[PDB]
Amino acid sequence: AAKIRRDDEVIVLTGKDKGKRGKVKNVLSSGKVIVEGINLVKKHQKPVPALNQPGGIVEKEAAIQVSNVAIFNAATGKADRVGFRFEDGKKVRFFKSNSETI
């Protein structure tokens, strides 16, 4: 019943990075997701003696709300909205505004 899922392509509706594009990383039951090289927060990390102890300041991919993002049509090359249909006998996804199979 979900629209975005484990692997897909998207673009930001609003926020810090608004107008920037990337694919999916992993989905969270919190209502959030992660994207590669979009949401970036400098973390001050502790040098754990176990294994390596780098400590230092590292950059990471922060979680983000779903409602602030939408798929990247990659035809008009901009935002577009999902709908659910039954193709053959199977539930699948399609675009609004130029309805097309995904």
Binding mask 23-52 for RNA (x = CB under 7 A): ---xxxx---------x-xxxxxxx-----
Min separation Cβ 86 and RNA, Å: 8
Return the residues of window 54-73 that contact RNA according to CB under 7 A. 55-57, 60, 62-68, 70
- To the nearest whole angstrom, how small is the minimum distance from the Cβ of residue 7 to RNA? 7
Q: Residue 57: enclosing H or E segment and its boundaries?
A: strand 57-61
- Dihedral sign of CA atoms 68, 34, 42, 17 in order: negative
